[PDB]
Amino acid sequence: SPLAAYEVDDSTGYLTSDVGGPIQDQTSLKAGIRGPTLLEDFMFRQKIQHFDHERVPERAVHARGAGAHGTFTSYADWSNITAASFLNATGKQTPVFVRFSTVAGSRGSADTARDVHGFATRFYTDEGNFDIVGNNIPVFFIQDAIQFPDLIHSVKPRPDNEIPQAATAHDSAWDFFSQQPSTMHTLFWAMSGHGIPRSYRHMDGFGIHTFRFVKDDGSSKLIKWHFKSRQGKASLVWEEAQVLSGKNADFHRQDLWDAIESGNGPEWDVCVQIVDESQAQAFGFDLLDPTKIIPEEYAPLTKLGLLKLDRNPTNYFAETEQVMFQPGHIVRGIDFTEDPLLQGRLFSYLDTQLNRNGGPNFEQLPINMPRVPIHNNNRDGAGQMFIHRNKYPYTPNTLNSGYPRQANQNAGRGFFTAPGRTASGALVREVSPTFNDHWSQPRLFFNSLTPVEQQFLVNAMRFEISLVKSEEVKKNVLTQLNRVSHDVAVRVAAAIGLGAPDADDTYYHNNKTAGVSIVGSGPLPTIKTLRVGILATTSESSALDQAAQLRTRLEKDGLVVTVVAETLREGVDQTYSTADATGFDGVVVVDGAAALFASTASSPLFPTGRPLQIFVDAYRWGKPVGVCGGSEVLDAADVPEDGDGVYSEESVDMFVEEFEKGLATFRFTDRFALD
Amino acid sequence: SPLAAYEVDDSTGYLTSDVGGPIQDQTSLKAGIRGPTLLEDFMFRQKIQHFDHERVPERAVHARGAGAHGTFTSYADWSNITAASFLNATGKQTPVFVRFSTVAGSRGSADTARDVHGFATRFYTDEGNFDIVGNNIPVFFIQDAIQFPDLIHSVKPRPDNEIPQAATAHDSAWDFFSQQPSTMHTLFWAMSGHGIPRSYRHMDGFGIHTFRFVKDDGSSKLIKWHFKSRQGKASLVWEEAQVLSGKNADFHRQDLWDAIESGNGPEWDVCVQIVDESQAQAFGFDLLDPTKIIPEEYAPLTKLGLLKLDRNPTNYFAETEQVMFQPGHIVRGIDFTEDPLLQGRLFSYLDTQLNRNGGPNFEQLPINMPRVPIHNNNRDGAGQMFIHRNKYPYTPNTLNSGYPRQANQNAGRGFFTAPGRTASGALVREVSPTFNDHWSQPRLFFNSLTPVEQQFLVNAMRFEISLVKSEEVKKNVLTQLNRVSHDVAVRVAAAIGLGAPDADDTYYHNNKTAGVSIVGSGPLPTIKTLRVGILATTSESSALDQAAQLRTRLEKDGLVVTVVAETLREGVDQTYSTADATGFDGVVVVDGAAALFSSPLFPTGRPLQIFVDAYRWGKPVGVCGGKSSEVLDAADVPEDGDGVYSEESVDMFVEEFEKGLATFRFTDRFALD
Numbered sequence A: 001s002p003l004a005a006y007e008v009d010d011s012t013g014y015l016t017s018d019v020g021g022p023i024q025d026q027t028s029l030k031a032g033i034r035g036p037t038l039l040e041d042f043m044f045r046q047k048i049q050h051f052d053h054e055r056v057p058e059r060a061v062h063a064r065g066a067g068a069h070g071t072f073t074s075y076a077d078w079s080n081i082t083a084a085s086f087l088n089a090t091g092k093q094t095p096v097f098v099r100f101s102t103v104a105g106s107r108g109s110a111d112t113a114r115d116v117h118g119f120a121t122r123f124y125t126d127e128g129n130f131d132i133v134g135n136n137i138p139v140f141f142i143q144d145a146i147q148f149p150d151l152i153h154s155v156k157p158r159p160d161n162e163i164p165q166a167a168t169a170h171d172s173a174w175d176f177f178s179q180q181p182s183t184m185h186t187l188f189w190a191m192s193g194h195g196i197p198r199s200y201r202h203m204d205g206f207g208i209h210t211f212r213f214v215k216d217d218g219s220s221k222l223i224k225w226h227f228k229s230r231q232g233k234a235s236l237v238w239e240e241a242q243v244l245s246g247k248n249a250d251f252h253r254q255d256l257w258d259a260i261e262s263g264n265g266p267e268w269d270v271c272v273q274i275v276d277e278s279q280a281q282a283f284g285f286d287l288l289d290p291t292k293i294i295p296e297e298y299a300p301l302t303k304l305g306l307l308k309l310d311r312n313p314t315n316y317f318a319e320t321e322q323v324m325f326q327p328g329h330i331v332r333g334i335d336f337t338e339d340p341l342l343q344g345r346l347f348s349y350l351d352t353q354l355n356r357n358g359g360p361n362f363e364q365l366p367i368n369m370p371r372v373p374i375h376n377n378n379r380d381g382a383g384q385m386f387i388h389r390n391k392y393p394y395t396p397n398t399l400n401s402g403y404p405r406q407a408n409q410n411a412g413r414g415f416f417t418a419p420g421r422t423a424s425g426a427l428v429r430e431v432s433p434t435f436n437d438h439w440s441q442p443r444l445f446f447n448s449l450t451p452v453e454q455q456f457l458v459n460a461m462r463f464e465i466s467l468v469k470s471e472e473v474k475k476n477v478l479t480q481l482n483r484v485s486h487d488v489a490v491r492v493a494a495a496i497g498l499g500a501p502d503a504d505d506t507y508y509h510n511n512k513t514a515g516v517s518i519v520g521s522g523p524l525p526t527i528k529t530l531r532v533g534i535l536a537t538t539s540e541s542s543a544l545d546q547a548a549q550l551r552t553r554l555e556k557d558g559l560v561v562t563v564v565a566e567t568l569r570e571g572v573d574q575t576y577s578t579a580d581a582t583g584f585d586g587v588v589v590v591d592g593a594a595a596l597f598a599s600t601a602s603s604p605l606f607p608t609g610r611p612l613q614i615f616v617d618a619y620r621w622g623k624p625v626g627v628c629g630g631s632e633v634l635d636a637a638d639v640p641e642d643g644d645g646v647y648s649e650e651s652v653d654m655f656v657e658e659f660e661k662g663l664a665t666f667r668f669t670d671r672f673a674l675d
Numbered sequence B: 001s002p003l004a005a006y007e008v009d010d011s012t013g014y015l016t017s018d019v020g021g022p023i024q025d026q027t028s029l030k031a032g033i034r035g036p037t038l039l040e041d042f043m044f045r046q047k048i049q050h051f052d053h054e055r056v057p058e059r060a061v062h063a064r065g066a067g068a069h070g071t072f073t074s075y076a077d078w079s080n081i082t083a084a085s086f087l088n089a090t091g092k093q094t095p096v097f098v099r100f101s102t103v104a105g106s107r108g109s110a111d112t113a114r115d116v117h118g119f120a121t122r123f124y125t126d127e128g129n130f131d132i133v134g135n136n137i138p139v140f141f142i143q144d145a146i147q148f149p150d151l152i153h154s155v156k157p158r159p160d161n162e163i164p165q166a167a168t169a170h171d172s173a174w175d176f177f178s179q180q181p182s183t184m185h186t187l188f189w190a191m192s193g194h195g196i197p198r199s200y201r202h203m204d205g206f207g208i209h210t211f212r213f214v215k216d217d218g219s220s221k222l223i224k225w226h227f228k229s230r231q232g233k234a235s236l237v238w239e240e241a242q243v244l245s246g247k248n249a250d251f252h253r254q255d256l257w258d259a260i261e262s263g264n265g266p267e268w269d270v271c272v273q274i275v276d277e278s279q280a281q282a283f284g285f286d287l288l289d290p291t292k293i294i295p296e297e298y299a300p301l302t303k304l305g306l307l308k309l310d311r312n313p314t315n316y317f318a319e320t321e322q323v324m325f326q327p328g329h330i331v332r333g334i335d336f337t338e339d340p341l342l343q344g345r346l347f348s349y350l351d352t353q354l355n356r357n358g359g360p361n362f363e364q365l366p367i368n369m370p371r372v373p374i375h376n377n378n379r380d381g382a383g384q385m386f387i388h389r390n391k392y393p394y395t396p397n398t399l400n401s402g403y404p405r406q407a408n409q410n411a412g413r414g415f416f417t418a419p420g421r422t423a424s425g426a427l428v429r430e431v432s433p434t435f436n437d438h439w440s441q442p443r444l445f446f447n448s449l450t451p452v453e454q455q456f457l458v459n460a461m462r463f464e465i466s467l468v469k470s471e472e473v474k475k476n477v478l479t480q481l482n483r484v485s486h487d488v489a490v491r492v493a494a495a496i497g498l499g500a501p502d503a504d505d506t507y508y509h510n511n512k513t514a515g516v517s518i519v520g521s522g523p524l525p526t527i528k529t530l531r532v533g534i535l536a537t538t539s540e541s542s543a544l545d546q547a548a549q550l551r552t553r554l555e556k557d558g559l560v561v562t563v564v565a566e567t568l569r570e571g572v573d574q575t576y577s578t579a580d581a582t583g584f585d586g587v588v589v590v591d592g593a594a595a596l597f598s599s600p601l602f603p604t605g606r607p608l609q610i611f612v613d614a615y616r617w618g619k620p621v622g623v624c625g626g627k628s629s630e631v632l633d634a635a636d637v638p639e640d641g642d643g644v645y646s647e648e649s650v651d652m653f654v655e656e657f658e659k660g661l662a663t664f665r666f667t668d669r670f671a672l673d
């Protein structure tokens, strides 16, 4: 509603100033036709002042990201576990807006950097805006919010030269990770495929912190939020991610945009783990510690409702850039915990909007407005867009008949702090000793990945640590990695020419947990939206016919098909010059195009070797690949015909049926070497 | 540093607040060891408030860039042509700060996007700060500053979804270009290798506009600024730039930073073309039109002095992010012209600093301060750092004895407007008809490029225009291109499966001009700083030995050598896993590593792909040690190719290879239409 009221249509009409005076804006007013521009040209100055002031500070973290509208629908009346109004009835719908992001990069940095990712969700509830400001990884680097600028200074570019962009592959970051062992768990997640998701739709969301569900009788339970993807879990490989950062920095935002435009809006089951207050230390670690997960073997997930994103913004700046999330946007039926990471966040997100917005009335921007009436005695401030009719904005008053009325647990559906909560003890700047195991869970996570996934994680660390210049930092990194796993430390040390420290088995173990592996999570549950590149030629009308035949068969099943040839024409979407294997989830060469794949093939229309390099890159990166028409191509690529995920069929139908199974498998991991 | 007065050392001492109270900053204050955080924790709040407020708006354009300090030295007393103090004596030195940039991308976008580039120079003169806010292309897309938001909206990402980053390769940009034909000249420059320079040190800087030099006696002449690189002109190739944008988004800033750190700070001759006022229309176009160059054949360059950058910043945000350039930072001896693009800039750069700084005292930031006293009656404002002793800040006054005194042509070395300038006519919002030829100069430029360079430009256009979804926009683009060159139109049209319109010869010609070609600009004058990747192996102790010997011989000549192998050790800089051909200007394989040409330590095929990419992209490549055929045959690289080297002798190999680094690119490796 606040959005619809502020939509501005410029599909017709004459140009006006911001005060509705019709004007022009194409030629400056000058003293003669070859003369100096005049100060009295208000048309020039208003247009250029606006331009000059377009930009606002980027977000201090998560500067790079993209958003969409949708709806949350409750599966049930959840009154038995929370008073939350948005959860109080089967089928109850609440509008949402979600923004997804990286963490370290500035605006304009690439989507496919290796990083932690944001997953921030606003529920415009009938009892106020409720935000769950989460990440795609369920644990955080640090245990106390006061350390956030340390973490973030260390990962962001070195501040003398501002190098490197959007990367932890520098001395300072690994200096911090090695000195602050709490970082191990999130580190291991970021060095897995969770640091390079295939799309925002193929990752989960996590609140990280323990929160409370509070009932209308005052009782509480402890919860963790999990948003579980209905699209499946999928990652890129690092070598692919690096090329994609160059070829399409906008890959995740375009994937989102496109999925929504085609009627394939992504979905998640909004879930919780729910445990009793008495179980704060029962699972072998402290539920106040944001570097720990509750293994699902100890507390299963309950599905609360469906999150669907199905509408793109109208103006990115107004909606996506200006959305201002806060964990302080809480509603009756939810409460905080004493997680010292959460506790400090509550301060930060209120304060930082003053930086972004430049003034205190940021909740008035349409994307930040609620969908219920606002009744309070907040007044004035720069940018004040309301005209308040209550001329006695103080409590207690008689002159406004004691309105607005105080809301609390007893009346008015007020927020209230869970009334069972207490504090006791000295006023301290001390870390709880219950937070001191920094290594067991990183090992739990590592144990739960498949062998090739473990290899990819090792290889990520090998990559990044080999770029650390400091020999001491690199030694200190091995010291910490060795506390998680001696084998990781040895394997990583081998790439950097150092020896690993001797095994220290204090935290070693062989326990695993379900639901953290990407490679182990089975085939994708849908292939709709996945991209197939068909490599063809204009030389041979046979090639274009085969391509068209595959197109119809793949499109029917919701795949996005790109036919690539030397030059554009009817049925060809993309020239070889602009094509890359990073643009596809699977690649098919029509056998009529075989000539383009020869070592001597050359054209002024694309770079030498491009058609073959698309095919070979796709294969090396694990993708389903094949040749359709029943040979030259598989041999030019040194691609084995018997390999899993390599397809070779004369029959278009048999080809598509086999090829679509391989898109669901998504990645053929047998093509990656192990230690 | 020139900013040493403002430096803060933290190499010793105990943590303090901003008001000097010693504190801690690692644990929050809590009501109990597992308790909630306390509002009274001022340590937490001051630290997190600062964090929360670290960011400032990026620049509205040229958001992505990097800078360095240096010195300008005059070659002579230029009293003959300008009263400018910084140019008034042979050997006179003035500190400078320079920022280079792209145009369209935000912060964090890649250095090697295809774009126009900024080259902004501040001279901290003894008569005030003087800025030349230029680009690496000598002409601008548009003819009136009022149009700047239109250009920039069209080239920046589409505003519904903010896609694409740092790119003209989208419908809106090509829509604007094809509807505003003024854009042709800059567009051809940007679609040339001038859109993807090899480094900031391998590009020139241009003021674009005609300015005036003004002597103390009031007379004036018309000038164009040219800063001509002493490193040579060089570009990337587009495939290479695309990969490099992913592998190293910081490539230009690192190149610069490393050059300075190694004592190879980049140099430019600061030059002008100098013509009489009576020549404003004499060259076949109007000197007020920023879409035109004065061909060097009509007005030669005069060298004024030397620009050398030789000191990197101490704090990037404080120095580079905060530097606030303005064309209104002008000094006695220089004046403006009635170029309608320049005229409107003067407003923009003073105003925009209010957005960036959040208040009016942005000239007090250390990087913005002048190196001479300030005497004026500007007062107050947020962030005011000065404590003014004059309590009568108005003119005219008696109560401060009439100080500060007015400065003008005749007293106090004042700035003064060139007194021969006049204006005549109606007050109009009309374009001079003298601006109307949008197409001849683009053709002049295109004609001046070599054949392969012409092909690269065609190829950049084919790449971008093929991404334009609108058939109508594509057709309109072909219409404009065809007015520059029919052949360009035909060759671009072929890629996008449309027919070019028939020849329209109104603006066609065969004239050329010197100094605009990159490919034609001959070997580089220096190879110092250029990057040689030596691909080796740890399996064979002789391969490491070969690499060490090559390293020695190459480093002697000031090349930056990287030895690559499977794993790090003594003498090996980089693993195959982190290496890429975009990291090198030439690639050498030692023949002890020939067996590499699969492993858990690097992606399949990586060693050979580095060599093959390097060859495909034009670089000098070769095999040192005598046995070349196994590597060269694996690569499909012909032993007899130009810029392909095979020698057993390390000296012979390096002597040959260095000639190839100076040639820089072997253009025979690219197909022509």
Ligand code: HDD
Pocket (backbone or CB within 6 Å): A059, A060, A061, A062, A065, A099, A100, A101, A117, A118, A119, A120, A133, A134, A135, A140, A144, A145, A146, A148, A207, A208, A209, A290, A323, A324, A325, A341, A344, A345, A348, A349, A350, A352, A353, B048, B051, B052
């Ligand atoms: C004490 C400070 C602090 C700490 C410990 C954290 N953050 Fe935060 N976060 C910020 C301070 C902050 C911020 C500076 O206040 C940002 C920048 C922009 C904004 O609105 O808030 C932010 C932004 C931000 C966003 C982007 C929201 C958007 O798309 O606009 C996400 C997703 C997160 N954070 C998620 C997390 C998670 C899951 C954390 C740990 C569980 C976390 N942050 C800890």
Ligand code: HDD
Pocket (backbone or CB within 6 Å): A048, A051, A052, B059, B060, B061, B062, B065, B099, B100, B101, B117, B118, B119, B120, B133, B134, B135, B140, B144, B145, B146, B148, B207, B208, B209, B290, B323, B324, B325, B341, B344, B345, B348, B349, B350, B352, B353
């Ligand atoms: C009407 C406005 C307008 C017009 C016509 C131009 N510019 Fe500009 N330019 C700006 C308005 C602007 C600005 C909005 O004022 C910026 C953003 C940051 C700043 O300080 O000024 C800017 C920044 C900016 C910078 C970055 C300086 C730095 O590194 O901080 C360079 C190099 C240029 N411009 C160069 C040019 C050149 C060579 C132009 C034409 C000859 C040009 N601009 C026309």
Ligand SMILES: [Ca+2]
Pocket (backbone or CB within 6 Å): A158, A170, A171, A172, A173
């Ligand atoms: Ca660093």
Ligand SMILES: [Ca+2]
Pocket (backbone or CB within 6 Å): A192, A193, A194, A235, A236, A453, A456, A518, A519
């Ligand atoms: Ca993976």
Ligand SMILES: [Ca+2]
Pocket (backbone or CB within 6 Å): B158, B170, B171, B172, B173
């Ligand atoms: Ca567009």
Ligand SMILES: [Ca+2]
Pocket (backbone or CB within 6 Å): A358, B358
């Ligand atoms: Ca402000």
Ligand SMILES: [Ca+2]
Pocket (backbone or CB within 6 Å): B415, B416, B417
């Ligand atoms: Ca004057």
